[PDB]
Amino acid sequence: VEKVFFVTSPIYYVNAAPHIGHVYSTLITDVIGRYHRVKGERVFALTGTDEHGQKVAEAAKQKQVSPYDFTTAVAGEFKKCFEQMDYSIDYFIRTTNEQHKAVVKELWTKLEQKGDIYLGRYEGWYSISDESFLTPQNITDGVDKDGNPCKVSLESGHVVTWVSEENYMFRLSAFRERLLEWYHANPGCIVPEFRRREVIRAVEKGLPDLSVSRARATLHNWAIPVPGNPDHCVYVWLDALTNYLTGSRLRVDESGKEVSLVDDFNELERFPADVHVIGKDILKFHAIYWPAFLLSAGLPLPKKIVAHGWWTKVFDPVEKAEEFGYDALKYFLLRESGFSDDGDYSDKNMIARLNGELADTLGNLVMRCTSAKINVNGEWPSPAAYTEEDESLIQLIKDLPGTADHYYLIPDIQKAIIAVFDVLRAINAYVTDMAPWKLVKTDPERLRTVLYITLEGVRVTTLLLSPILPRKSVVIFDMLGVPEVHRKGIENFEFGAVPPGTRLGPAVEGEVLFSKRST
Numbered sequence: 001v002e003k004v005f006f007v008t009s010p011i012y013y014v015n016a017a018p019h020i021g022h023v024y025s026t027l028i029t030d031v032i033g034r035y036h037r038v039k040g041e042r043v044f045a046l047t048g049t050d051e052h053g054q055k056v057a058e059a060a061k062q063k064q065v066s067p068y069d070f071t072t073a074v075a076g077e078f079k080k081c082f083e084q085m086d087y088s089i090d091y092f093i094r095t096t097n098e099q100h101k102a103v104v105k106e107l108w109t110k111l112e113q114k115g116d117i118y119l120g121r122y123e124g125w126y127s128i129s130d131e132s133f134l135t136p137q138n139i140t141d142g143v144d145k146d147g148n149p150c151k152v153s154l155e156s157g158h159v160v161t162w163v164s165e166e167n168y169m170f171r172l173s174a175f176r177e178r179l180l181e182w183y184h185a186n187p188g189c190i191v192p193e194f195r196r197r198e199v200i201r202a203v204e205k206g207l208p209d210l211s212v213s214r215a216r217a218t219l220h221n222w223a224i225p226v227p228g229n230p231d232h233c234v235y236v237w238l239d240a241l242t243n244y245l246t247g248s249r250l251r252v253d254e255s256g257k258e259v260s261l262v263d264d265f266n267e268l269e270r271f272p273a274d275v276h277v278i279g280k281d282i283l284k285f286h287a288i289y290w291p292a293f294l295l296s297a298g299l300p301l302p303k304k305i306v307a308h309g310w311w312t313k314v315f316d317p318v319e320k321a322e323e324f325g326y327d328a329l330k331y332f333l334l335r336e337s338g339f340s341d342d343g344d345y346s347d348k349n350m351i352a353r354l355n356g357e358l359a360d361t362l363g364n365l366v367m368r369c370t371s372a373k374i375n376v377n378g379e380w381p382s383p384a385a386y387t388e389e390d391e392s393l394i395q396l397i398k399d400l401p402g403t404a405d406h407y408y409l410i411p412d413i414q415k416a417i418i419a420v421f422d423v424l425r426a427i428n429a430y431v432t433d434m435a436p437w438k439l440v441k442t443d444p445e446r447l448r449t450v451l452y453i454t455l456e457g458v459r460v461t462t463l464l465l466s467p468i469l470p471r472k473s474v475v476i477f478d479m480l481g482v483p484e485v486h487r488k489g490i491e492n493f494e495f496g497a498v499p500p501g502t503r504l505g506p507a508v509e510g511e512v513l514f515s516k517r518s519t
């Protein structure tokens with residue numbers, strides 16, 4: 001089905017200021033978004049803020065400000081952070097938005113009409129910080145900020161409290177068999193694979209019904225009212241998860257403001273998400289509750305949920321981007337960690353990767369193929385006959401787009417970067433063997449062949465890196481003199497798409513692409 005590629009970040013709680021966790025989650029969302037745009041697809045990338053609930057209201061009360069003022073302020077800090085980080089997200093949703101609330105009520109009403117919401121009790125543990133219901137097996141003894149002996153979440157270590165409320169209850173237990181069918185029928189729907197296995201084990205163990213409302217006093221009245229029962233408010237997670245549906249139904253203008261909410265999601269061709277990006281801490285909500293809601297409502301299910309190794313919720317990313325470069329930082333975060341949390345975030349290692357990979361591997365190579373010394377005519381030369389060594393490198397360059405594409409689609413952005421850099425290392429090796437600096441005098445016919453391959457290797461690697469390094473890719477292409485039309489589209493993944501005779505861009509006397517730093 002030709003649709004709009006719909007990729008989401010989670011919507012972030014506004015109890016605290018934006019931080020690296022949020023920036024990472026939204027970076028992954030953004031990169032996926034960018035890759036599909038580079039592929040020539042229609043894209044709708046979504047991010048935003050999760051503004052209702054007990055936690056946000058209590059954080060606003062601690063600041064001695066009204067929940068409305070506080071959410072608006074913090075949402076502003078989030079918006080500004082994401083502008084600073086130079087993302088290309090299509091819309092920023094807020095759960096306080098009136099159109100969002102409409103969609104929630106509409107969804108609630110469907111679930112109710114379907115017979116899947118009933119009036120019952122929740123008597124059990126709850127983590128206000130996680131906004132999560134927990135069984136007694138998921139808690140242990142612990143300490144709080146008054147040093148007192150309390151109970152805490154095994155998940156997150158935050159304080160838990162016993163709740164005993166009459167609550168609207170969603171019949172999650174009825175969806176165990178259908179969820180298991182879904183997981184088994186769609187074995188790539190949860191990535192990475194060990195998290196897919198974790199979800200399945202949990203659903204196999206059995207599912208309780210889920211409390212989807214709370215008494216309004218418990219939430220300090222800071223929530224969406226239940227349709228036809230103002231004594232109750234809608235659970236912040238049903239509220240929150242529904243942002244993805246709301247987002248898929250908003251017409252947005254050129255400045256990024258929502259102008260209209262369509263009735264039927266099919267009108268905008270976004271729903272359901274192709275990729276939900278989340279942290280590992282909210283997997284249950286996205287892989288169990290969310291599909292169960294959609295199943296109840298007869299709505300289509302997402303294609304993939306990708307759960308990274310970090311938590312959704314010092315090291316300030318805007319500070320480090322100003323210190324080391326924006327694209328460089330993004331590169332580092334995406335390169336340094338896969339789905340394991342174990343990975344070394346340190347000035348030592350940021351500099352190791354900056355110098356080793358960005359400067360010495362990529363940057364070095366860009367300068368070699370464009371310098372006046374080696375590229376004497378300042379153009380893409382026409383190649384002479386290819387040796388078997390030439391062919392071996394060409395093969396790597398030809399194969400790379402297909403390999404990188406599979407990685408980007410999993411999605412595993414670390415592996416995609418690695419694949420591209422393997423080819424970059426190969427090109428450096430090739431350039432070392434051929435010694436094109438010697439060939440300017442010794443054999444100019446041979447240099448044409450060597451230079452051309454080098455240029456084309458640089459173009460193709462750069463094109464596949466352009467979702468990771470959106471600014472630097474533009475600079476590289478300007479130096480190489482790659483016309484705008486050749487900077488995107490699957491057609492331009494092909495070897496040879498830029499014809500010989502293309503002139504390089506002008507240089508400037510101070511130009512480095514990535515400046516190395518002191519160790």
Ligand code: MET
Pocket residue numbers: 009010011012013050240241242243282312313
């Ligand atoms: C529907 S995604 C909700 C994410 C949640 N607000 C968090 O900050 O973890």
